[PDB]
Amino acid sequence: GRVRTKTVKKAARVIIEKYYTRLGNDFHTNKRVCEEIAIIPSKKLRNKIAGYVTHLMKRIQRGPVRG
Amino acid sequence: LVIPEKFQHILRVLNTNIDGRRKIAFAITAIKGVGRRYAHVVLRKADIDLTKRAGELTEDEVERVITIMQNPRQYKIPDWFLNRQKDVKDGKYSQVLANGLDNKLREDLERLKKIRAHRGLRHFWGLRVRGQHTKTTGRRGRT
Amino acid sequence: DKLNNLVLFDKATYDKLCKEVPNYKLITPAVVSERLKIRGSLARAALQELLSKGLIKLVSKHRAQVIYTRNT
Amino acid sequence: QSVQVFGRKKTATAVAHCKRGNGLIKVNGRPLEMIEPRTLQYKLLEPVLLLGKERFAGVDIRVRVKGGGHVAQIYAIRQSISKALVAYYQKYVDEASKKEIKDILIQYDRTLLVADPRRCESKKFGGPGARARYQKSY
Amino acid sequence: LRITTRKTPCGEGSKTWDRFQMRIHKRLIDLHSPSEIVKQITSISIEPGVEVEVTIA
Amino acid sequence: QPIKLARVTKVLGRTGSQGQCTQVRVEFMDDTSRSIIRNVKGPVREGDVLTLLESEREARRL
Amino acid sequence: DIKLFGKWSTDDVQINDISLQDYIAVKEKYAKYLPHSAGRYAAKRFRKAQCPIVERLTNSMMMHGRNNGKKLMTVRIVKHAFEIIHLLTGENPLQVLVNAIINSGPREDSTRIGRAGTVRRQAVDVSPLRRVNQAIWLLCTGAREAAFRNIKTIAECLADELINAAKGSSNSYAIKKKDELERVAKSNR
RNA sequence: ACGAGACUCUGGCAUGCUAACUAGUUACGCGACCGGUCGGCGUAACUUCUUAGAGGGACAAGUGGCGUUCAGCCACCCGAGAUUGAGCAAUAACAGGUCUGUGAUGCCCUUAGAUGUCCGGGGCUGCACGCGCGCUACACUGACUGGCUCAGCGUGUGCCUACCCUACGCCGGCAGGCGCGGGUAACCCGUUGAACCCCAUUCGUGAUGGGGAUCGGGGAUUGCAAUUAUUCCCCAUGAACGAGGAAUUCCCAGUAAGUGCGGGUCAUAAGCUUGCGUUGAUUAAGUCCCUGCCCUUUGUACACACCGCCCGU
């Protein structure tokens, strides 16, 4: 099961709500910017939030995101 | 030495009849004490080729084997390698063939009951010698 | 149960055995034992003896798979 | 020269020292044609004759092995040989034939370059094995 | 160091065990110097739980 | 007992008391116009071809 | 060259099932000099068919709590009877192997079908993968029982069962099992 | 918001990096072949080859088919890795076991007539049988002369603690006597040379060699005290088992399974358990049957909650 929980989804939602311009286009840029401006204790969690940031931004190119 | 036709069914112990189908190093397992590695070692040091079969069992072979099984000191074999070391109730050192003389020694049930020994009473009822504890478990004997 | 097989040396290991194993195309101790009514143990022993005589072609040897084929 | 980059399978590993030598491949003082199981020699000559016995033109490859299990050493000794060939063929000589032989052995199988990450798991208590448990008492 | 201990004080229930593991990490520092200099460096309020064995040869 | 060809085009679902079979849609290659339903037993890949005794069989349908 | 064991040619096989070479393959590039590559196909799904079927054999006559963990013995015992079918039929063992896999491979089986009943069975089509699995299982069951307690050794009981299953002969235990499956498919429509 | 997740050790790529003299392969002869090959190793020695550090890496990130086009699911190329395994695990509760685990404890026998307590000489150490975890097998995919040779967690000389591992000479098949030493430890056994297998030996369908499972003697080391040779072996003893009814444990990847070594108990001790390696599948990537788990709807005269409530003679 690869369902992303509310922690990942909500942190990515807050990040894209807050630092929408600060984001990048590549996932590896996204994890670096996320680790710059977020107290994410561990590498795995910051990776997961970064990945959902990439997917949410991919969803941005075609329309709004509800949250 | 080598001869195609010497196959006989019976070896002489006390004029009784035995089996003679087994091969060499295994046809002399019909004796109570001879067999296992005892027969293997006597044939091994007998200075003969062991590829021979039951049919090539010569009378000279049997005679030499009988002589070697009479006394172990043919190749300086100690008595404990036989099933009977210094005997009980007599000061001998050898195993006796046939029946009625060796099996007389094995009956060991009354005299130990005279001294109220546990070994004699245990062998009196046919119980376990290795010491198998008996509480309820066991699937042999009555079913 | 009951062990009773041929242990006698007679006209069964040389005749009808040395005259029917060479003429067949597959030769195995089990095959020789089954097709020629002979004992598999003595089949192995005689096959080793005739290999020492040198009248077969050996591919490989094993405890249960000794591979022979006709050579002469 | 030491262009060795592991080459592994299970807990056993091989290091394929390579140099400009005679074209004879050695495995800790014994030729690859003679290994203790006497059964996996074809598994060892597979890479060389798959890519071509003509490739070795004066290259001395000594592989030193260490680990548990003979067959576990194999699939890594040959992996070490393939790694040493890759390192030699990447250091100076071209890549077109390198990519050709790489495609050929990659379609042949995958355990010539990339190691198997598998390993023996621990055993969990309350059972005879890691996943097997004792019989239920009625 | 592994110590696998049954959890229930009296044998009952499922066969359950704790696995207490003791990790002991050991470094060596061998320096070319008289031990008096190393002892001068030593008085630095060494961390508790770190034990020192002195080897001079 | 005529035998023709049939190849999978749609895995409709899993059937059976304990997941025994796959209700799958199969087309006949010799006709490439008919779709029938079969409770095929075993792992089935979308596009496999099998020789069959039956060309009209149907099973429990829902 | 990619000949099996370096002695049995691999550029001669003909499955003759129109489209089944993706589920029975000995020509495929995964087919190697030896049938030993350690278990890596069983992890995922539809990857089992990518196995070189020689490996599936050497692991299917590899069972019964007395053989598990003895795979080198299985590879020796398949070299045995490969070089024996090389002489018994005078042809490449791969041809008789594909004949056996194309005939012994079942088509119709009978299974319980329904959500509310338990009275009878219903005919079902056995997919190629399951058909080769159960055909090799019947072959190995016969080869075990044909040399079990018997004077006949391995590589000949297996050999006999393979040859009399490859030609379609019903004398084979595997072919009689196939006939039994077909008849129980007839008797449970 | 707690729980799940997240967390942490990690299994798995460090070819990049701090870096070993308790780690290790290659610049010249040590006993051999006109250039190749040694764990008594050659002068010279670089972190690739074992340990243990920091940072990195894997995210359904990339493509394709489905999807209320979403959450997600299924295939594919690269990649070491596209589900590595476990300890933590809720609110709330039990009349489930433990007063025979405890110097944590409640009227009765116990008020010194003290269910072991100083010393210590028997006791859960019994025989007719019912599917209680498991044990070696029924054989030729094999026990078997022996050839070759590959292991990983560990455990290890010490407070009323001899006894722990354990490199040779002599002897002794079997255990063991004295010594020069090796070990607080990757320095010592150790390169756990090991052990399963690598099939050259009688073996052929049996009572002999599958099956020591059923006899009496003897050397003897830790043990004042081996009486049911309890435990260290040598000879003889082949009973039963021809892979076994109905009901029926357990098992998806280095897994099941086969296989030996280690820790626990410990006079030196394992048919048990706990770890470790080694060898190592077709098992299906599904459904809820007949197994439990009570989630939603529903009925209730139950709420001590169906082991409820209750009617009548």
Side-chain angles (χ1 to χ4, degrees), chain C residues 1-3 5 29-30 39-42 44 48 61-64:
Chain C
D1 196 25
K2 300 186 191 84
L3 183 69
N5 289 83
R39 194 172 191 233
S41 166
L42 256 52
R44 297 181 304 122
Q48 281 194 127
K61 62 157 195 183
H62 268 79
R63 34 94 177 181

Side-chain angles (χ1 to χ4, degrees), chain G residues 157-173:
Chain G
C157 74
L158 185 151
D160 176 33
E161 180 167 18
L162 183 275
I163 40 185
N164 76 343
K167 246 190 307 203
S169 156
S170 212
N171 192 33
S172 177
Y173 192 72

Side-chain angles (χ1 to χ4, degrees), chain G residues 9-163:
Chain G
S9 266
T10 202
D11 284 296
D12 68 325
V13 305
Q14 293 298 130
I15 295 291
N16 53 265
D17 206 350
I18 305 196
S19 174
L20 195 82
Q21 36 207 40
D22 307 84
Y23 314 116
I24 169 65
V26 72
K27 160 56 79 205
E28 65 176 331
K29 307 308 154 197
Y30 289 90
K32 169 174 28 203
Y33 288 6
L34 322 178
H36 183 293
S37 53
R40 191 69 202 240
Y41 299 114
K44 306 307 290 291
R45 301 307 318 222
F46 289 123
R47 190 172 331 276
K48 50 185 299 196
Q50 309 297 317
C51 190
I53 46 75
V54 278
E55 184 125 49
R56 175 151 301 132
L57 283 286
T58 166
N59 252 338
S60 177
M61 322 72 87
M62 169 31 162
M63 85 320 304
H64 261 292
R66 252 295 183 158
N67 310 284
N68 288 315
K70 314 290 162 188
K71 195 176 184 200
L72 305 149
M73 298 54 275
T74 83
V75 91
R76 303 187 83 127
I77 296 164
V78 296
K79 273 198 289 133
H80 310 351
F82 272 173
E83 54 196 298
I84 296 186
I85 275 65
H86 181 59
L87 50 85
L88 200 295
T89 151
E91 281 177 47
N92 174 216
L94 307 183
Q95 302 328 100
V96 298
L97 174 53
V98 305
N99 286 125
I101 217 70
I102 207 48
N103 271 19
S104 301
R107 156 62 184 74
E108 276 218 76
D109 264 353
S110 211
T111 50
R112 162 85 87 253
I113 279 193
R115 303 300 189 273
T118 180
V119 46
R120 60 155 159 166
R121 291 175 92 108
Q122 165 60 255
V124 285
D125 179 14
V126 156
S127 212
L129 318 198
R130 165 159 335 284
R131 97 199 189 143
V132 317
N133 295 121
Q134 67 168 252
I136 195 170
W137 195 77
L138 312 159
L139 276 150
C140 301
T141 286
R144 150 176 39 103
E145 78 196 18
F148 190 45
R149 172 201 308 71
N150 215 12
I151 201 147
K152 175 175 320 281
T153 43
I154 200 46
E156 300 186 279
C157 74
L158 185 151
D160 176 33
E161 180 167 18
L162 183 275
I163 40 185

Side-chain angles (χ1 to χ4, degrees), chain D residues 100-136:
Chain D
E100 161 184 66
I101 74 175
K102 214 64 77 50
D103 295 4
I104 290 165
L105 39 69
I106 276 288
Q107 61 82 49
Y108 194 67
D109 62 33
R110 274 284 306 275
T111 173
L112 293 179
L113 304 318
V114 280
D116 257 339
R118 320 200 262 136
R119 206 63 42 97
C120 309
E121 308 158 11
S122 173
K123 163 175 153 303
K124 322 297 137 70
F125 70 96
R131 312 299 178 90
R133 333 306 297 134
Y134 310 122
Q135 159 185 15
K136 253 158 73 213

Side-chain angles (χ1 to χ4, degrees), chain D residues 80-99:
Chain D
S80 57
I81 306 179
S82 211
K83 157 273 289 188
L85 261 76
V86 165
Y88 173 67
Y89 212 106
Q90 185 164 276
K91 160 191 66 221
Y92 293 147
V93 60
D94 79 310
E95 298 319 297
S97 293
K98 166 82 149 281
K99 300 314 290 175

Side-chain angles (χ1 to χ4, degrees), chain B residues 32-33 35-36 53 80-83 128 134-135 137 139:
Chain B
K32 197 172 189 195
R36 202 69 278 184
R53 305 314 159 99
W80 40 252
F81 208 83
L82 278 156
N83 64 277
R128 284 314 282 139
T134 57
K135 297 294 169 188
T137 281
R139 270 168 227 222

